[PDB]
Amino acid sequence: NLTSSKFEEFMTRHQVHEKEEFKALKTLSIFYQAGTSKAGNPIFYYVARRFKTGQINGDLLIYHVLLTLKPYYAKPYEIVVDLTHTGPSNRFKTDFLSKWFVVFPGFAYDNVSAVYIYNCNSWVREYTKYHERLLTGLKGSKRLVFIDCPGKLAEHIEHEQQKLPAATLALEEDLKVFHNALKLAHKDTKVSIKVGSTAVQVTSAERTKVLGQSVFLNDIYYASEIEEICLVDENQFTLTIANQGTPLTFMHQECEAIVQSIIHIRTRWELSQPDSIPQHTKIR
Numbered sequence: 247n248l249t250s251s252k253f254e255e256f257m258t259r260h261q262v263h264e265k266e267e268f269k270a271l272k273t274l275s276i277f278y279q280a281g282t283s284k285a286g287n288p289i290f291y292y293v294a295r296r297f298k299t300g301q302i303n304g305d306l307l308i309y310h311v312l313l314t315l316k317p318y319y320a321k322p323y324e325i326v327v328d329l330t331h332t333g334p335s336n337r338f339k340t341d342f343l344s345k346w347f348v349v350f351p352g353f354a355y356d357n358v359s360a361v362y363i364y365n366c367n368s369w370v371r372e373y374t375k376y377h378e379r380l381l382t383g384l385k386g387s388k389r390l391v392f393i394d395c396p397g398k399l400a401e402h403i404e405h406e407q408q409k410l411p412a413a414t415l416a417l418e419e420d421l422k423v424f425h426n427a428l429k430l431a432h433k434d435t436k437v438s439i440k441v442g443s444t445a446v447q448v449t450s451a452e453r454t455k456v457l458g459q460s461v462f463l464n465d466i467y468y469a470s471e472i473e474e475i476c477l478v479d480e481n482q483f484t485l486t487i488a489n490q491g492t493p494l495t496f497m498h499q500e501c502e503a504i505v506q507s508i509i510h511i512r513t514r515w516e517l518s519q520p521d522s523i524p525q526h527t528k529i530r
């Protein structure tokens with residue numbers, strides 16, 4: 247017996263404005279409004295990789311999202327979802343994922359004009375497949391728009407109005423592209439490794455079906471997550487990532503040149519961290 251009105255009433259009396267954990271949600275900037283699109287509707291951003299799946303009460307996030315939509319959700323609006331560097335540590339669960347469908351007034355769902363998903367990656371696609379039963383409503387919908395490059399965003403949201411997180415923008419500068427590479431797995435597929443100053447981006451060069459739509463799957467591995475860099479052969483090199491299990495092996499004509507480039511970034515981070523040395527070793 248849960249509806250949009252009871253949830254709204256419950257939070258109000260269960261006062262949360264002075265919790266000192268509801269305030270931090272604003273500074274963290276998980277959900278905020280910025281700019282307007284060509285059609286003239288306001289645009290809201292959702293930074294997906296700022297939510298830790300077990301550190302705050304889930305109901306607080308819903309209330310914060312709701313409280314910033316009341317003045318606007320009576321008319322059409324648009325949402326930009328930023329999935330940069332999203333992983334299993336910031337997922338929703340079935341108990342908490344199904345709440346999002348039964349908490350807002352029924353017309354709030356209809357006013358959503360379009361959705362712009364940004365920087366999808368492999369984990370998200372697998373996450374969608376597992377929960378495909380719930381997300382059947384979104385299957386094949388025409389309101390989902392997938393962005394392939396930052397330039398395409400200009401068409402829908404005009405430049406000088408887009409406000410993405412400062413971190414997200416920094417991940418598209420000083421790039422060192424290596425086109426035509428190939429990824430070695432159970433089923434290989436073209437990729438294009440890029441090695442910026444801070445992190446390594448494995449941008450797939452082939453479109454794949456996500457929620458019934460073809461799209462590219464860009465993946466980002468940060469320096470701190472890089473553990474092993476080796477060159478088995480000039481044809482192939484292998485990378486090991488923390489907590490990801492099996493290492494990733496790729497084939498390129500100049501793997502040694504690419505392998506050298508990654509080492510430079512890793513070495514600089516080693517100097518960057520001030521801590522002398524960690525204590526003990528984690529074993530699984």
Ligand SMILES: CCCCCCCCCCCCCCCCCC(=O)O[C@@H](COC(=O)CCCCCCCCCCCCCCC)COP(=O)(O)OCCN
Nearest residue numbers: 292294311336337338346347350354355358361374383384
């Ligand atoms: C109603 C307004 C909702 C505003 C939400 C703002 C915050 C965005 C957060 C997006 C990620 C987390 C929530 C994802 C589930 C949202 C489910 C939902 O509300 O879906 C309905 C409305 O959705 C929308 O209008 C916008 C959908 C947002 C984008 C969804 C992306 C899905 C792709 C995978 C996301 C993986 C996220 C991983 C964890 C962060 C679909 O329409 P319907 O016909 O089923 O509704 C009638 C139900 N009685």
